[PDB]
């Protein structure tokens, strides 16, 4: 979850020009147009910043892309914002260049009190400083987004129901971390626990669903050693940690959640 997944999230593509939570005309992914009434302005700056007529997804994260840019540059070059920005972590970056995106590098930095709140990781604080703001009252829900942001250092306001179980299922694992995908699978302790594999950007987690005999297992994928293919069972896949060894089977489609796991562990 770049800023870019999160902003399209809450701005939505729009190839079309429409109108923002004012009277103001908008464009693609968020590109405040003009804030004068009638479209004449409108796709004067239109062509303007492309093409004529409207747009397509080539030229909206086009637009898109150069916005992201233009907020994090503000914020760089702000003596309010850059401070709080370098001392935070990824994702509440991601939340600051949210609402710069939303709001101007200048609006952003009107919240002396909550900025100063932030820089000294006093988040529960900034948050019900952040929301007694206009701006928590123009755009309640992605203000609850990002403040949430603020509030938990996670992505979790941006992500699927399967995420919000998956984190509660097992807590607290990472910041940033996301779920990917999911599947069925037998864990192989003293017998073989029926459960569910969850991959995700930052851990292997397992779940067991035998009634009555619960077990979880989480494993960080950068403690994990070898990654095999077991010889003996198609269906199995081995993981080896600095500290023990899993075997993982009955996975319906096992050379593609071991090709997935490749990959997504190669990363971390």
Same mark, same amino acid.
């Given at each position: @979850?770049?800023?870019?997944?999160?902003? &399209?999230?809450?701005?939505?593509?729009?190839?079309?020009? *429409?109108?923002?939570?004012?009277?103001?005309?908008? =464009?693609?992914?968020?590109?405040?147009?003009?804030?004068?009434? $009638?479209?004449?302005?409108?796709?004067?700056?239109?062509?303007?910043?492309?093409?004529?007529?409207?747009? +397509?997804?080539?030229?909206? #994260?086009?637009?898109?892309? /150069?916005?992201?840019?233009?907020?994090?540059?503000?914020?760089? &070059?702000?003596?309010?914002?850059?401070?709080? *920005?370098? $001392?935070?972590?990824?994702? &509440?970056?991601?939340?600051?260049? !949210?609402?710069?995106?939303?709001?101007?590098?200048?609006?952003?930095?009107?919240?002396?009190? @909550?900025?100063?709140?932030?820089? /000294?990781?006093?988040?529960?604080?900034?948050?019900?400083?952040?929301?007694?703001?206009?701006?928590?009252?123009?755009?309640?829900? &992605?203000?609850?987004?990002?403040?949430?942001?603020?509030?938990?250092?996670?992505?979790?306001?941006?992500?699927? #129901?399967? !995420?919000?179980?998956?984190? /509660?299922?097992?807590?607290?694992?990472?910041?940033?971390?996301?779920? =990917?995908?999911? *599947?069925?699978?037998?864990?192989?302790?003293?017998?073989?626990?029926?459960?569910?594999?969850?991959?995700?950007?930052?851990?292997?987690?397992?779940?067991?669903?035998?009634? !009555?005999?619960?077990?979880?297992?989480?494993?960080?994928?950068?403690?994990?050693?070898?990654?095999?293919?077991?010889?003996?069972?198609? $269906?199995?896949? @081995?993981?080896?940690?600095?500290?023990?060894?899993?075997?993982? @089977?009955?996975? =319906?489609?096992?050379?593609?959640?071991? /090709?997935? =796991? +490749?990959?997504?562990? $190669?990363?971390?």
């Amino acid at each position: @979850s770049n800023i870019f997944e999160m902003l &399209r999230i809450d701005e939505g593509l729009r190839l079309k020009i *429409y109108k923002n939570t004012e009277g103001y005309y908008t =464009i693609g992914i968020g590109h405040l147009l003009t804030k004068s009434p $009638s479209l004449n302005a409108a796709k004067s700056e239109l062509d303007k910043a492309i093409t004529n007529g409207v747009i +397509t997804k080539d030229e909206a #994260e086009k637009l898109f892309n /150069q916005d992201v840019d233009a907020a994090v540059r503000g914020i760089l &070059r702000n003596a309010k914002l850059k401070p709080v *920005y370098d $001392s935070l972590d990824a994702v &509440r970056r991601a939340a600051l260049i !949210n609402m710069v995106f939303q709001m101007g590098e200048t609006g952003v930095a009107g919240f002396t009190n @909550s900025l100063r709140m932030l820089q /000294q990781k006093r988040w529960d604080e900034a948050a019900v400083n952040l929301a007694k703001s206009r701006w928590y009252n123009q755009t309640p829900n &992605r203000a609850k987004r990002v403040i949430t942001t603020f509030r938990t250092g996670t992505w979790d306001a941006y992500g699927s #129901e399967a !995420n919000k179980k998956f984190r /509660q299922m097992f807590k607290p694992l990472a910041p940033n971390t996301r779920l =990917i995908t999911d *599947y069925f699978c037998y864990f192989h302790r003293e017998f073989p626990y029926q459960g569910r594999i969850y991959l995700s950007n930052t851990h292997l987690c397992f779940n067991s669903t035998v009634l !009555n005999w619960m077990a979880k297992l989480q494993i960080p994928l950068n403690e994990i050693k070898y990654l095999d293919k077991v010889t003996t069972n198609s $269906s199995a896949i @081995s993981v080896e940690t600095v500290t023990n060894r899993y075997t993982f @089977s009955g996975f =319906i489609a096992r050379d593609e959640v071991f /090709q997935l =796991i +490749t990959r997504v562990w $190669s990363k971390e």
